[PDB]
Amino acid sequence: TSVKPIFSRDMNEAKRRVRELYRAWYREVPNTVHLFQLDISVKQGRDKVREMFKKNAHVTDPRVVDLLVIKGKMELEETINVWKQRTHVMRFFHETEAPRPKDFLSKFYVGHDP
Amino acid sequence: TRPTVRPRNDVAHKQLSAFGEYVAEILPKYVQQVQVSCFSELEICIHPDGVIPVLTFLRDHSNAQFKSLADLTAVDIPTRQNRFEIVYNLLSLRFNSRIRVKTYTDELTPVESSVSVYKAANWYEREIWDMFGVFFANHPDLRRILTDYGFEGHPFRKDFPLSGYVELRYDDEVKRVVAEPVELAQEFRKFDLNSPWEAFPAYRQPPE
Amino acid sequence: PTVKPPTARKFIWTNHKFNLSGTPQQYVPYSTTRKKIQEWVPPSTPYK
Amino acid sequence: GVRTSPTGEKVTHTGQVYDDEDYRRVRFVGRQKEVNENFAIDLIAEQPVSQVGSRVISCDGGGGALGHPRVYINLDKETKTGTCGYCGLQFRQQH
Amino acid sequence: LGLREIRIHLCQRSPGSQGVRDFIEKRYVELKKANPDLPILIRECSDVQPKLWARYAFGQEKNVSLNNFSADQVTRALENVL
Amino acid sequence: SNLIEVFVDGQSVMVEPGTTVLQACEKVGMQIPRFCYHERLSVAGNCRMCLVEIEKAPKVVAACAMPVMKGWNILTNSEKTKKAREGVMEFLLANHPLDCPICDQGGECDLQDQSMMFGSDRSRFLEGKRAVEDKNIGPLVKTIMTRCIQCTRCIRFASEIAGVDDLGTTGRGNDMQVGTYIEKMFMSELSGNIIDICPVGALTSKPYAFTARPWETRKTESIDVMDAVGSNIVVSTRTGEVMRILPRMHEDINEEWISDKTRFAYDGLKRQRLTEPMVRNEKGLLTHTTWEDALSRVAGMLQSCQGNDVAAIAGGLVDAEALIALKDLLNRVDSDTLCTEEVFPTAGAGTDLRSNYLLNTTIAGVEEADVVLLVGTNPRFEAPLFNARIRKSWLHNDLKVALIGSPVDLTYRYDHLGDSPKILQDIASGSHPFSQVLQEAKKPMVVLGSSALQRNDGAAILAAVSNIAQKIRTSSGVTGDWKVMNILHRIASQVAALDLGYKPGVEAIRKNPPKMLFLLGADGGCVTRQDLPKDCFIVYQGHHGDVGAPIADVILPGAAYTEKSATYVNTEGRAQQTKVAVMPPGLAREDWKIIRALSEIAGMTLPYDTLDQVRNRLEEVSPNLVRYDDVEGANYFQQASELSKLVNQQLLADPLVPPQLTIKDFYMTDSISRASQTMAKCVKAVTE
Amino acid sequence: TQLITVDEKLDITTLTGVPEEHIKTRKARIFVPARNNMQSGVNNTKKWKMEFDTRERWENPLMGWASTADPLSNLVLTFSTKEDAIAFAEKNGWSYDVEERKVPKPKSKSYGANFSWNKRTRVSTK
Ligand code: SF4
Ligand code: SF4
């Protein structure tokens, strides 16, 4: 499996490109949250940005890390333009509950569930 | 026989066999299979490292113009080492002939994005990036086309099901459109239609 | 239809309930389907 | 004809008529629970079963391509009338 | 606490399991014949570590293995459980 | 050496002598269209469809029944091959009525698929097509005599396997009728297994008849229940529900068949199920409530009670998950008495010593046998496919079968020995006209039944079984390597409970009458409340409770076998499993789910939540329940025999007699047929 | 350009974006759909079907239809081998249970074995 690379030869440029992506997302929040006329503080949106980076801790392969950086760069293009809208950014937020449980007791009463 | 059976051609089949053998000889570097079916349209089947060389050679060399492009499709097949199949389909203007140029690839290894020799393939390449995931190195813009912005998954796969993982409705609580896990109103009763008794005996692979 | 008046079928409406969407007399849907699983009957007499 | 459920309404020809505490009744508020008062079984009772002098006979249903394909039924047993699967009307023999 | 039950998990080939085959050929009838209400049990499917386990003291599963172990060590841990 | 060169269209293949053209084509990948052949039935050349052309052969032969000489070459795409098949196809579709809508096998016909792929299109024979009057073959199998293509597959099946022999052909020529001459109904075992065999839609299912259509039902793997054999069955499920079941083949066990009881035991599965958790009411009335208050009440009461006076009877259909979760809970409280309905008598440590309680031989290995004796049961009713494979083995390689304990209604010309277990000990000690061939035999198999196992004669009868086993296995010039003494059961959870090492029977309940107990599947007459102390506290957990559910105190609506991914065990230790076909109706959670929720509401916990954790703990109880579909064979006959010699008794002088004596007795004696309308219909149509 | 190899699996399980319960909890089943016994012929064999576990289908409260909360209920992945089935299942992420392939054992059968002078196979009606 001597696979062709994408962007990085090892994990070093992978970490460098994803930290550059996170740099762009930190400096990308206030312009969009002031432009799109949202209802949410800047710090809460930045915390969901860092939470979405925290979701992907198990990602190992350099192809996959580079492909996540490609997806993030494409979405940052579509959010530095207004191709997307308020609906999509509020769809990144999960506000309209859906308070769907995790306890086995609450998976038992409200049941037919694992 | 004389009616009601579509008559086959002979000399066009001979010429396409000769031309496929011609191409297969004069490019020993990127040739695996050439084949002709009964309805006489040429097929070339290619390792994915000479895509721009084969398309430049099949745009010029003056005994094969083939100036018209079609469809690119990386038609998804499971079970294989290489799922995705890039399928070029070319038509010539001075010749009246049809070739299919099928090169193969897997889920992650990119190909060289042949937009620089055929300008038609730009939106085709963007579309097949959005629907499959065959990444395209040396390409200007990979945006998403035929999909929603906030949607992802490359949904023409056999993994993504028929109905989606997303559903949209409206609420007046926050005065906007929200997404939900999907809730079909009908089962989509799938029809088992796999008949017994050897539908075509001529296409019997060697049994394991 | 005054060229051919009769027909020897006898089940047809001869009242002609006309087009009716927008009344208190219109269609409502219901599945013509009996009970599916038929739950267990709790016993009539008590015990102890 | 329609029967009388304990709800005071029209039952169905197949037994789906409501229980006394179904809230589908209270989504039937103020509108017609429509029913076809002509029932299917009510016409078979008024059928004159004919008397054909052959043994195994045919049934088409009044002209080909207006009705059902050719079905062939038997008139052996005199304890049971020969019932068509498509027509829903019986046949008998005499001799 | 109350010495409820003992389990032995065996297989078809391992050297320690061959020692426990020597145990079941030599010194098994002493155990149950001397102990009528001490329900040990034997479990085999095809291939497993010869697990010597003990379920007692209200849901305590003591746990030793018997890979490349002697039959004297079988008797020794048998007495330690006993 | 018996490797014969035949060429399929030029390509070579080695073929045994005696094997036909068709098994050669199945070896290379071809099939020949055929009707009167069937791969697990007898062979005749009736249907004429399988015609085929050989190179240099002016005589076209039927490829179903040809002895294959050396060096053939077979054309399966030639000219007169297709001409002969299209001719025969135009022949067969002349006396067949236009019934393909109202036929029940419209999605699963054979005339239709072969008339597409091998037939002509523009028919002939403008006038004719006589029709034949039907008659009911029974209440369970709907019969139309008209669609019969006279293939003679049901008849040879009856003649060679069923042994009832009431189904023949009358008349001649065109006017040939199939079935019954004397208008006598057919109510025997495996009478439902003729709807899988009739290749056209002639003999179809009466209760299934017009409730579905095959191209709309999705299929799911399932395991045969109310037996101990476990056929490879399939729930052809439909519309949030079920609506069809069928059998499927396995390697060793249960070839292409099923119990008729099982086949028509889906209505009673869906008939009167328990759906809601229920608590008794102040006048004393069993009313229903939410899981909250009910399980809080039961969990607080379980926090109250302690000691050996808490019991759990796992009768009938319960799970691996049910038994493991119940064992973990009842160990976690302080102590236990886990019990089963059918009492398994132990006097020489019968709980452990794996080989003594199960069918030690191979089910397909009864064909390998020569000398099989049968000590009391009636195997026509208990596991009928076991009896069917015994009869097929006796048909082919001529079994020598004895019967000891009771003269019963088995139909394959059995030898009989004095119908009393004292005469079985007279076999074990003295000589008899079966004992000479039995002792100087080659291959000993001893099938023990469990109908007469509930009486207290179990120790000495099991000792005589062990004496026969040891004496013949160390006798007859053999050291072993093939087995004897295989015993069987009825309930799968019995063998699962023995594999988990449980306190057998209600012995510990009749010794210590307990305070709190859990009735998991209580329908037989195990206990009464008036044979129980003043702590009358039972949690009856089950499904469609008839007997015990008006008696009960707390109803818990458990799920059934179609509704939960439960691992079950057949009579020979093989571990099969089901998948969740339909999520259960009502509230109706699973078994381990209810037990772990009860543990959560009570003041304790169970350290597993998911099924992967369940099966890790399942292997950490016993390794025999993760290696699915792998046959397990135990040993140590001498150790079991030297432990079995502790206490022996004088036998009871009563000759044993089965309760499973007739067909109606087989029908009404289980919970699902006790529920279902259609089994009541077939019982009253046997009587009347 | 001859990049390094590693003894690892593939990790598209966060590239395809399927939600997490549908990732983990869907215990797949790889099976051979065997011969439909009411039919005849094993043409429908030779294709390994990876399918998924079923979940609830409840009554539609207006029509009695089976409305489901399942995207992953109607999938059927068609394979040719078993190793590639294991490879695809490790590639995309979920777990699975495996049935074997249980071919029919060929048995010796003959019409000249159906008839005999001193063996007990006797059709007596043909
Ligand atoms: S069995 Fe006969 S009636 Fe039924 S589908 Fe086949 S051809 Fe039609
Ligand atoms: S009833 Fe069915 S199985 Fe029997 S001869 Fe007729 S078509 Fe064949």
Ligand code: FES
């Ligand atoms: S199968 Fe050979 S003739 Fe019927």
Ligand SMILES: [Zn+2]
């Ligand atoms: Zn008719």
